[PDB]
């Protein structure tokens, strides 16, 4: 089963974007559905063999085969259309779906959800939940970035470097420990705010409660 290899995509709250690539076009429309256009070359123009429209919870997948020439927007669907649900999708479409999944995932990891201003830094929790990327942009120039795996740090001088594992955490210049302490305070806070606002949204029935900016630079 596909569910055993990746999780279903989520396109909620993602800004529209039309990204051309060498073998494909990917588009996040205004409706938040996600479209993937397959591009083939003939003669001297490029066409679109099939279109994969994915719902916002990617649960319902509409896929169609028109013949259309590439354009500024995705082709409109014909009648030769196939409608599938996530768990009955045949292997032939999995690789494409995993392509859209990895794309959405990367966009989420750079699309802010909660911005938070402290007396020393501008925090930014991204949308790639759970274990979302977490940037701490200290005002003095120091940068910090936390992923489920690596943790990137930069210093004013530009000594850009990275770290692995919890082996070196304690043994470090206590100034950098100060930066990490403030960043973990911010992370706990931002996750708490996300959780409580989400819960009220669970009750609520209207317009989104995210993105959200908190505080201000003095």
């Amino acid at each position: 089963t596909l569910r055993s290899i990746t999780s279903p995509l989520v396109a909620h709250r993602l800004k529209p974007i039309r990204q051309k690539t060498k073998k494909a076009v990917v588009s996040i429309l205004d409706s938040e559905e996600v479209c993937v256009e397959l591009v083939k070359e003939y003669a001297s123009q490029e066409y679109v063999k099939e279109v994969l429209q994915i719902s916002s919870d990617g649960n319902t997948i509409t896929i169609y085969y028109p013949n259309f020439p590439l354009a500024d927007r995705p082709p409109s669907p014909t009648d030769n259309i196939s409608r599938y649900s996530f768990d009955n999708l045949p292997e032939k479409y999995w690789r494409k779906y995993q392509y859209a999944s990895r794309f959405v995932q990367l966009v989420r990891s750079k699309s802010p959800k909660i911005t938070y201003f402290t007396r020393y830094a501008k925090c930014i929790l991204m949308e790639n939940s759970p274990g979302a990327d977490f940037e701490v942009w200290f005002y003095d120039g120091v940068k910090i970035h936390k992923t489920e795996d690596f943790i990137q740090v930069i210093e004013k001088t530009g000594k850009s470097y990275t770290l692995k594992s919890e082996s070196e955490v304690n043994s470090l210049k206590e100034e950098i420990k100060m930066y990490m302490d403030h960043a973990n305070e911010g992370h706990r806070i931002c996750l708490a705010l996300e959780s409580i606002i989400s819960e009220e949204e669970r009750k609520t029935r209207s317009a989104p409660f995210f993105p959200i900016i908190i505080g201000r630079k003095p």
Binding site: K15, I17, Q19, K20, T21, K22, K23, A24, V26, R95, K96, Q98, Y99, F103, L106, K110, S111, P112, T115, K122, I124, I213
Partner: peptide
């Protein structure tokens, strides 16, 4: 397709726009 790279500069303009309200 599972070879494709898609992280080029138009996406960089998109990301700039994302962080501009900050």
């Amino acid at each position: 397709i599972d070879d494709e790279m898609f992280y080029d500069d138009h996406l960089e303009a998109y990301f700039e726009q994302l962080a501009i309200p900050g």
